[PDB]
RNA sequence: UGAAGAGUUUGAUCAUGGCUCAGAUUGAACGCUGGCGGCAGGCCUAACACAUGCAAGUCGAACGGUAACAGGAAGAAGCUUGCUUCUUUGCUGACGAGUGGCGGACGGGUGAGUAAUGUCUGGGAAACUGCCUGAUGGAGGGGGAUAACUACUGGAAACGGUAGCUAAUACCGCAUAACGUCGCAAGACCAAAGAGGGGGACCUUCGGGCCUCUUGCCAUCGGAUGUGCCCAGAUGGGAUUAGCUAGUAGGUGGGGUAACGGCUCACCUAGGCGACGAUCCCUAGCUGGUCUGAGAGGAUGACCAGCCACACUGGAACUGAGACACGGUCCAGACUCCUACGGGAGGCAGCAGUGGGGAAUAUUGCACAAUGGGCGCAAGCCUGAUGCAGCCAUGCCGCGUGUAUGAAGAAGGCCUUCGGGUUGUAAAGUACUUUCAGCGGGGAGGAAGGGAGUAAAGUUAAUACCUUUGCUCAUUGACGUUACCCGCAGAAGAAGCACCGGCUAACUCCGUGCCAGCAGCCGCGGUAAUACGGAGGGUGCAAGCGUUAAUCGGAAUUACUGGGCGUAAAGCGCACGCAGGCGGUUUGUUAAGUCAGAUGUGAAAUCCCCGGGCUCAACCUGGGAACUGCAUCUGAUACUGGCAA
């Protein structure tokens, strides 16, 4: 069981999430498996705030991954 | 490869245990050269099939008695 | 501090002329240079190696207005561009926003230009800029504000600039006071400030 | 120990009380077989194994004894009788 | 793309060599001084003891229940007139406690202990693995109970104990039995729990049976994951620690553990380990990494990340997929507290605070907004994780404390040959601007999801449910009196510290006179002190500066890179020689070393290159490189090593 989730590592009064594959039995900013891109809500189209990896995840989900509200709906914001 | 070390016996005083002595060329990055660092190890043997000073082939493997995890595959020669 | 101390007096203590707080009317007429800063400023000492390096450093240092701490930051940015880091170093000191604006004739002086950068007078694009340590980008849009050309300071600050060489790596404008940082400063655009040898000695310690 | 969840101790205890009994049963029945081994009573060995064969297994499926432990028990046991009777 | 040197021994000189300084830095501390904002960081010492508050529970869609709340109804009142009040009642939301599940092994903290079978790195095989997820099948029919509860009863409390009664996704049979387990085969054997939503046709003495959906439940084999286990190498110091080691080392056979194993046990052998450094002692969390550095290297391991250990001290097992369990349990011990003195309670190395100790380290803050975590079928709750605020120049960075112009070069000092010179365009004076701060007014973005509907070409009852999909609507903001922006007067409110003999940038004047005192080093000072003290002037840094401590550098100053040893420190008094190190030459071979390519692997962050995002930079960030390595695979054969000749 892996758990794909957000992880803010960005400086104060400026969220920079990081969609990561971890496990839920460890720290949000702590122990990770491997990334699956980023989520920046501060992008507004002067830079790209995302990195997809659609492919990678699609394998991981079958491998028993779990998606949190945000992460799941964030594939949805960009659809395919 | 079964992690094969061409070692040289140095102890038949037990039956099914023979201490084989092997070395790797260990380098110092601060003396900046290789040397011979010889390390005796405790191998698990079929019975005995060799004398001392017997060049052999040994291999890694399961543990199966205290400080064992190498086996004798064959006795190369008694003397070179 | 930001210095902003007794300006010219350093020109005195180095015996070398600069426009910093001088006019174009006073050029050491009714002002004095080098007569004797202090009561010992008349007589000249030979100076040790370290002597030269210190004095000379301060020469370059005060015709941008730049501090110590600031200068180190410049030195690790110079040696973080692939080039001659003598050039890179003095290129970045003439990369200070306060300086390019002066060198496009919008500042009366080097120093007065930075008084502008204090207030919301300077801008790049539609973006307001108040920080002078900003190294402008190749092909910039470094304009004055609408509601800043109406001030009597900004009108009078194109005035004192007039009749200078204006070493070209950039455009000098008067329709919209909007230039372009259209190539970098270079060894040829030094105007006899070639003292890159000194400070790179000083700094490497 | 003012916490709510310190009530778990009571739960643990209903548990320990029960889990104890399960271990005890098995722990004894397995010895009745080793009786027939050491004393050499060939018939008995079989018969005594057969009576405890289900028992030790059930507990395991549940998790009391667990799957993997009873495995090795059942191996050792039968092993005895094969070389004996 | 990158490496600085000077002083200090001599009357003078060059070497040799120790010492010093210049530098960067640090969880820094202190003194003096103080404008902000942004970001980061903020008990290192006694792993010392803690007042007080809070951080571990949550699910009624598993229960038996109804205590409260809120509603429904029934009798009744009040007769606020058909409405409020009252008793009754699980009827419905909803939920106390209690059972029961799952979490409570996460996250958070700390480095005491631990030089190692602990870590790190790389391999590896005789392992296990709940929640997740794939595949196949199953889930049949029963029973005996026990909390609660009730009625008592023991105690001052703390805290219990009886008797009767009862529930389950509780417990345990019995039934069923593969790709299952044991077994050579033959054979034998082992499991469960169903809950909800909704509904037409039948059935209910009307709670339900029925069907359908849906999730869950049981098993077995997978996958992914976490966690054990083994091996080799790397891991700190000290040989004024050289001998050590009986479950000690190994072999047999039992037992045990999830699995291998002296893990443990019976017997048998007498070895095993060690200067290629065991064992023992001191010291220390370890690593990525960090800092410094030109690199190599050294030192170091704070915050951030991973691992290990520890949880009042000592110790132990139980449960469970997993623990040797921080806020579990039990025992002992020293503490602390309660007490009706009989007997009991607790554990801040969690957050915040407290005293103490120390040179030193912040609020008994706010919050469910966002992100993440826990449970749940969902709502929702729980969250000192976290996100923020407050307090602190602790540091890095950004910007400001004014701009222009301004000389009979103003008074006022100071020095002076008494002509001035110096302070000094500095100030005033003139024209100019209000950032930042302050006040008043606007004002983004971090917020999507969910929630109330409708659309499905799903599943089935033919459009339920549930899920799915976009759509439709009303909201979701703790920070916060917000990032930011607008206006408002008026330079207004915003510069100091150290040093100036030489090293080393920067001199004079008095006061004192080997006295006073200075002092990083070399040294000053016994009456014109460029070195003291004060002043005038100046130099460098600057909201910080200096001083100290501490690390590394410089220092090739212990030299792998990168040293000497004739006399400066420095060749054992001299031989032989084991181990160790080294190896003339020719052919052949091997390919271990080595080189190359290939493949894994070298976490991320940190670092680095290019390039974005915060008004810029600091910081944050994207991709790529580095990731000095290691192993394996396949190739190469000159050298190196091995063998043969």
């Amino acid at each position: 069981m892996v758990t794909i989730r957000l992880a803010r590592h960005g400086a104060k009064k400026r969220p920079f999430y990081q969609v990561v594959v971890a496990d839920s039995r460890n720290a949000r900013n702590g122990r990770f498996i491997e990334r699956v891109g980023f989520f920046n809500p501060i992008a507004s189209e002067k830079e790209e705030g995302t990195r997809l990896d659609l492919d990678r995840i699609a394998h991981w989900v079958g491998q028993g991954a779990t998606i949190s509200d945000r992460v799941a709906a964030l594939i949805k914001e960009v659809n395919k | 490869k079964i992690r094969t070390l061409q070692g040289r016996v140095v102890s038949d005083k037990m039956e099914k245990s023979i201490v084989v002595a092997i070395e790797r060329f260990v380098k110092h990055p601060i003396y900046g050269k290789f040397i011979k660092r010889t390390t005796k190890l405790h191998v698990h043997d079929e019975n005995n099939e060799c004398g001392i000073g017997d060049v052999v082939e040994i291999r890694e493997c399961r543990p199966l008695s205290k400080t064992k995890s190498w086996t004798l595959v064959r006795v190369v020669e008694k003397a070179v | 501090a930001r210095y902003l101390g007794p300006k010219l007096k350093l020109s005195r203590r180095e015996g070398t002329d600069l426009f910093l707080k001088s006019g174009v009317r006073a050029i050491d007429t009714k002002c004095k240079i080098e007569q004797a800063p202090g009561q010992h400023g008349a007589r000249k000492p030979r100076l040790s190696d370290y002597g030269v390096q210190l004095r000379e450093k301060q020469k370059v240092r005060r015709i941008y207005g730049v501090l110590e701490r600031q200068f180190r930051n410049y030195y690790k940015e110079a040696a973080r561009l692939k080039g001659n880091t003598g050039e890179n170093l003095l290129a970045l000191l003439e990369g200070r926003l306060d300086n390019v604006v002066y060198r496009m004739g919008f500042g009366a002086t080097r120093a007065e230009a930075r008084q502008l950068v204090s207030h919301k007078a300077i801008m790049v694009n539609g973006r307001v800029v108040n920080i002078a340590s900003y190294q402008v980008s190749p092909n910039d849009v470094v304009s004055i504000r609408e509601k800043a050309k109406k001030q009597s300071r900004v009108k009078a600050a194109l005035e004192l600039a007039e009749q200078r060489e204006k070493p070209t790596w950039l455009e000098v404008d008067a329709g919209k006071m909007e230039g372009t940082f259209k190539r970098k400063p270079e060894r040829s655009d030094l105007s006899a400030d070639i003292n890159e040898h000194l400070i790179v000695e000083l700094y490497s310690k | 120990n003012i916490k709510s969840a310190k009530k778990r101790a009571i739960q643990s205890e209903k548990a320990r009380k029960h889990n104890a009994s399960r271990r005890s049963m098995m722990r004894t029945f397995i010895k009745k077989v080793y009786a027939a081994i050491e004393a050499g009573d060939k018939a008995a060995a079989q018969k005594a194994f057969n009576e405890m064969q289900p028992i030790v297994d059930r507990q395991a499926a549940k998790g009391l004894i667990h799957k993997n432990k009873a495995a090795r028990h059942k191996a050792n046991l039968t092993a005895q009788i094969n070389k004996l009777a």
Side-chain angles (χ1 to χ4, degrees), chain B residues 5-17:
Chain B
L5 224 293
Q6 287 197 30
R8 189 189 67 250
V9 183
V10 56
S11 305
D12 300 66
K13 286 305 289 278
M14 302 65 66
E15 188 169 275
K16 329 195 177 47
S17 310

Side-chain angles (χ1 to χ4, degrees), chain A residues 3-12 14-35 39 41 68 70-71:
Chain A
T3 305
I4 313 183
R5 35 186 199 174
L6 305 181
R8 174 186 185 168
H9 304 316
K12 194 151 92 286
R14 189 183 172 278
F16 181 76
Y17 303 106
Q18 184 170 274
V19 67
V20 56
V21 172
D23 311 276
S24 53
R25 45 200 78 252
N26 296 102
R28 56 186 310 278
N29 292 351
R31 187 167 160 198
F32 295 157
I33 308 307
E34 36 48 57
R35 298 169 64 183
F39 175 37
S68 64
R70 261 278 175 239
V71 322

Side-chain angles (χ1 to χ4, degrees), chain C residues 147-160:
Chain C
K147 65 194 188 192
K149 295 179 192 81
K150 311 270 179 62
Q151 306 293 275
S152 296
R153 192 175 64 174
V154 192
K155 287 169 204 197
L158 318 182
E159 312 306 290
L160 271 59

Side-chain angles (χ1 to χ4, degrees), chain C residues 3-23:
Chain C
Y3 189 66
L4 294 170
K7 301 186 208 173
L8 311 177
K9 201 188 197 288
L10 286 171
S11 313
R12 310 193 69 224
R13 197 77 174 139
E14 185 53 92
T16 299
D17 302 292
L18 293 162
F19 288 158
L20 300 157
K21 186 169 185 182
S22 311

Side-chain angles (χ1 to χ4, degrees), chain C:
Chain C
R2 300 293 308 153
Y3 189 66
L4 294 170
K7 301 186 208 173
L8 311 177
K9 201 188 197 288
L10 286 171
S11 313
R12 310 193 69 224
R13 197 77 174 139
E14 185 53 92
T16 299
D17 302 292
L18 293 162
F19 288 158
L20 300 157
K21 186 169 185 182
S22 311
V24 279
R25 51 198 55 68
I27 40 170
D28 290 311
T29 54
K30 305 158 158 296
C31 280
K32 68 198 184 179
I33 192 166
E34 74 50 83
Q35 199 180 339
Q39 57 197 138
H40 302 285
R43 43 105 269 228
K44 174 66 174 279
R46 277 211 214 181
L47 292 185
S48 302
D49 193 8
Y50 296 98
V52 189
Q53 296 172 48
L54 172 275
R55 285 291 188 203
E56 294 295 306
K57 168 180 125 299
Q58 183 60 242
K59 197 190 300 194
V60 183
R61 189 161 179 296
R62 69 195 183 237
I63 177 45
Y64 300 100
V66 75
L67 298 169
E68 187 159 294
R69 63 169 192 150
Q70 304 204 108
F71 233 130
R72 310 175 291 167
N73 299 0
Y74 298 134
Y75 200 52
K76 58 199 187 153
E77 182 71 289
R80 189 139 288 208
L81 185 30
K82 299 185 183 185
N84 194 91
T85 56
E87 188 48 48
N88 306 340
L89 175 53
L90 292 173
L92 298 167
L93 310 181
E94 295 159 46
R96 308 196 68 223
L97 190 64
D98 69 306
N99 198 256
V100 298
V101 169
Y102 164 63
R103 305 279 178 110
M104 293 175 159
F106 301 166
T109 56
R110 97 87 186 117
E112 197 285 342
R114 184 155 59 102
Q115 177 66 12
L116 311 172
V117 181
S118 315
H119 292 108
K120 294 183 166 182
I122 313 307
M123 50 168 49
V124 297
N125 317 98
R127 190 180 79 198
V128 306
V129 178
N130 290 293
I131 294 92
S133 281
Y134 173 47
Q135 303 294 297
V136 275
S137 62
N139 307 120
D140 202 59
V141 183
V142 46
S143 304
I144 302 291
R145 184 172 52 167
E146 190 70 78
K147 65 194 188 192
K149 295 179 192 81
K150 311 270 179 62
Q151 306 293 275
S152 296
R153 192 175 64 174
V154 192
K155 287 169 204 197
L158 318 182
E159 312 306 290
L160 271 59
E162 288 179 7
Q163 318 301 116
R164 311 157 180 179
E165 179 60 27
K166 299 282 86 145
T168 323
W169 57 95
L170 31 61
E171 276 286 304
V172 168
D173 192 29
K176 295 200 161 185
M177 289 75 174
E178 160 180 314
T180 47
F181 183 68
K182 59 144 170 53
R183 49 173 173 252
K184 286 306 190 174
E186 276 299 302
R187 170 66 61 64
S188 80
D189 289 281
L190 298 165
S191 299
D193 302 315
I194 306 169
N195 302 108
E196 41 164 72
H197 292 267
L198 295 285
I199 43 179
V200 70
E201 180 66 70
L202 200 287
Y203 288 123
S204 64
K205 194 165 286 156

